[PDB]
Amino acid sequence: LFKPSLCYKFNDGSSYTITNQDFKCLFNKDWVNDSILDFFTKFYIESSIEKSIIKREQVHLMSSFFYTKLISNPADYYSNVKKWVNNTDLFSKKYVVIPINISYHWFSCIITNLDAILDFPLVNILTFDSLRQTHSREIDPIKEFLISYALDKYSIQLDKTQIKMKTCPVPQQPNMSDCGVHVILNIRKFFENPVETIDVWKNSKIKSKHFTAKMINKYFDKNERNSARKNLRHTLKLLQLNYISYLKKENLYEEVMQM
């Protein structure tokens, strides 16, 4: 039982509802659905903002549906998401976070250095995947998005060769259905210290593949990944219990259960 559904309010006024249908994917090794993943990427970035690790204005988090909308009609990537990005200002962000959901395979990228383009310089799309794969083909639509975005919002002519996909090492584990859990924890780790994480990835080719694997596995707490699913359940379950306490304090519990 995960009832009533969790209703969580973030400090930017946004509200998320997590139902039992969403919560139950955190059992066994079920595919992590969009609700769980978008909630937790939001959750851990807000935590980073609360701790003053980053400032709110430095980060833009896309929901997982952005990329799917982007490529829904490849005759014109930008037209697909033009309304989506109305009244955004992505090139003032230090970190633009884009989780990617393709054929039940989760991975993610983080766009850096956009805030250096306006002042003007290489845009780095930091792409990380728990499977042993590189994503040139899937990141290319994001390159074209950035070029069109730059022209549309700032009248800037942005050269594609200024935009580089960087394959960033994170713990690897071949369960595709665990990929959503790795995305959550990789993003979470990044925003406990972005500058340091960027440096770890940047220097991932200085030492041998074996030295780097140990370094990457330690930095990203690979030894805890086996239990990550359970810890996410405990976090949600706990957030729900506090919500129930709130509902019972305000005498709203019966109304919500009825509805």
Side-chain angles (χ1 to χ4, degrees):
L1 305 176
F2 191 80
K3 206 182 148 185
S5 306
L6 169 60
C7 187
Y8 196 83
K9 40 174 175 283
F10 290 109
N11 293 128
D12 64 356
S14 54
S15 185
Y16 293 64
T17 291
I18 298 304
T19 70
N20 182 66
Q21 213 64 202
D22 307 317
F23 173 81
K24 81 191 181 184
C25 74
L26 298 170
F27 287 93
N28 305 307
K29 296 166 189 182
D30 285 6
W31 177 69
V32 175
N33 58 59
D34 305 307
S35 300
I36 293 301
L37 190 136
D38 290 324
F39 173 76
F40 270 119
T41 63
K42 180 75 164 160
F43 184 82
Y44 288 120
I45 290 177
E46 290 285 326
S47 165
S48 173
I49 293 169
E50 298 174 51
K51 301 190 170 68
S52 328
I53 297 175
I54 61 159
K55 308 179 190 77
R56 182 170 300 280
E57 56 259 46
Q58 299 176 330
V59 61
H60 193 280
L61 170 61
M62 294 294 195
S63 92
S64 63
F65 294 90
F66 169 79
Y67 182 91
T68 300
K69 187 69 172 159
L70 181 59
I71 68 159
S72 69
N73 176 339
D76 188 343
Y77 292 128
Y78 193 64
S79 293
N80 294 335
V81 293
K82 183 162 176 56
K83 177 185 305 199
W84 197 291
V85 303
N86 184 250
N87 279 347
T88 61
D89 184 15
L90 297 181
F91 285 41
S92 69
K93 310 295 160 180
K94 286 188 163 305
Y95 321 105
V96 182
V97 181
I98 304 176
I100 294 176
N101 167 22
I102 298 177
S103 303
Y104 289 91
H105 175 192
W106 281 109
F107 64 95
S108 182
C109 68
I110 298 182
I111 312 182
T112 64
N113 284 335
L114 296 173
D115 65 316
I117 293 301
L118 277 180
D119 312 2
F120 186 93
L122 287 183
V123 177
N124 296 319
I125 301 175
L126 309 176
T127 312
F128 40 101
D129 183 3
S130 53
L131 303 183
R132 289 175 61 107
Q133 301 182 14
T134 63
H135 298 293
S136 187
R137 277 184 296 100
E138 298 82 49
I139 294 308
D140 178 83
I142 301 179
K143 299 201 184 177
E144 298 291 333
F145 166 79
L146 292 172
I147 292 176
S148 299
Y149 190 92
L151 183 66
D152 180 25
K153 302 306 184 189
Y154 318 105
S155 292
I156 277 173
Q157 286 176 286
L158 183 60
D159 212 342
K160 194 163 176 174
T161 65
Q162 260 184 283
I163 312 177
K164 294 306 176 195
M165 179 196 66
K166 304 280 181 183
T167 293
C168 299
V170 286
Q172 299 189 124
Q173 210 284 332
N175 300 346
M176 188 162 71
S177 66
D178 284 339
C179 287
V181 174
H182 287 273
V183 162
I184 292 168
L185 271 92
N186 289 338
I187 289 174
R188 176 181 181 188
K189 175 63 55 168
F190 180 96
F191 282 98
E192 299 176 335
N193 189 332
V195 170
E196 184 180 61
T197 309
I198 291 171
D199 278 326
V200 174
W201 286 336
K202 239 160 214 181
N203 293 112
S204 61
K205 291 181 203 169
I206 297 302
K207 311 300 266 185
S208 66
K209 170 171 162 48
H210 174 249
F211 180 105
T212 303
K214 278 187 41 181
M215 165 174 59
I216 288 303
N217 287 339
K218 185 168 173 295
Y219 190 77
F220 286 95
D221 306 324
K222 182 176 183 181
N223 65 324
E224 301 168 7
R225 292 290 166 111
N226 181 31
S227 307
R229 219 176 253 271
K230 166 177 202 163
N231 287 312
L232 297 172
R233 287 204 322 271
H234 190 248
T235 297
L236 273 181
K237 190 57 201 172
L238 188 27
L239 291 181
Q240 199 233 4
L241 288 174
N242 299 338
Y243 179 59
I244 289 170
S245 291
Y246 164 74
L247 289 176
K248 288 174 158 174
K249 188 187 191 65
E250 300 302 308
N251 300 292
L252 300 172
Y253 177 75
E254 288 302 330
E255 167 181 31
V256 161
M257 292 295 289
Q258 201 85 29
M259 301 172 163

